[PDB]
Design a binder for this molecule. Structure first.
Ligand code: HEM
Length: 155
C-alpha cells in the first residue's frame, strides 16, 4: 500500500543487499549519523566513550544495537506499509524511553540513504532512492502519529 508495487520492489531489492551484512551496514549508518548530526550521539549512553570510528566499529555493543534496529526496520519495510503492529512498540520505546525526536529519525534516514548508496550504487539509483525515501517518509509519518497517540509531540 501507499507506495506502488514497483517502488516496494526497489526498496526490498536494496534491502536484500543490506541483509548480506546487517552488522556492517548498522555500524556505518550509526557512524555516519554521529558524524553528520553530533547531537544524536548523546542518546546512546553506552557509546560516549567510543571516540574514534575504529572504536565504534570494534564495539560489539554498538554492532548489536545496530543489528537490532536494522532488523526491526527490515521487518517493517517487508510489510509494504501494513506496519501498525510493528510500529506501536517502536514508538513506545523511542518516544517514552529513548526520547528520540522525529527529526532524529530524519537524520538516521539520511544516513541510511547515504550508506546504501555508498555501498550499492548499481542497485540503488535514482528511482530506488526515491522509493526508499518514500518508504522512510511513511515510516516517520506513521510513527509520529503513534507518538502523538501516546501523548508525545516528538518535536
Ligand atoms: C529507522 C529508525 C530506527 C529504528 C528502526 C530503531 C529501532 C530500534 C530497536 C528495534 C531498538 C531496540 C528496542 C527498543 O528499545 O526499542 C532500538 C533501541 C534504541 N534506539 Fe532506535 N531505532 C531507530 C532510530 C533511532 C534513532 C534515530 C535514535 C537516536 C538518535 C535511536 C536511539 C535508540 C536507543 C538509544 C536505543 C537503546 C539501545 C540500547 O540501549 O541497547 N533509535 N532502536
Amino acid at each position: 500500500m501507499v507506495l506502488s508495487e514497483g517502488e516496494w520492489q526497489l526498496v526490498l531489492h536494496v534491502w536484500a543487499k543490506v541483509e548480506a551484512d546487517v552488522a556492517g551496514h548498522g555500524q556505518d549508518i550509526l557512524i555516519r549519523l554521529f558524524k553528520s548530526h553530533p547531537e544524536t550521539l548523546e542518546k546512546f549512553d553506552r557509546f560516549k566513550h567510543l571516540k574514534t570510528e575504529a572504536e565504534m566499529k570494534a564495539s560489539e555493543d554498538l554492532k548489536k544495537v545496530g543489528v537490532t534496529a536494522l532488523t526491526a526496520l527490515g521487518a517493517i519495510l517487508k510489510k509494504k506499509g501494513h506496519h501498525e503492529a510493528e510500529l506501536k512498540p517502536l514508538a513506545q520505546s523511542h518516544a517514552t524511553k529513548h526520547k528520540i525526536p522525529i527529526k532524529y529519525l530524519e537524520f538516521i534516514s539520511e544516513a541510511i540513504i547515504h550508506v546504501l548508496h555508498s555501498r550499492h550504487p548499481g542497485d540503488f539509483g535514482a528511482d530506488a532512492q526515491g522509493a526508499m525515501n518514500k518508504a522512510l517518509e511513511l515510516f516517520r509519518k506513521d510513527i509520529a502519529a503513534k507518538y502523538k497517540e501516546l501523548g508525545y509531540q516528538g518535536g
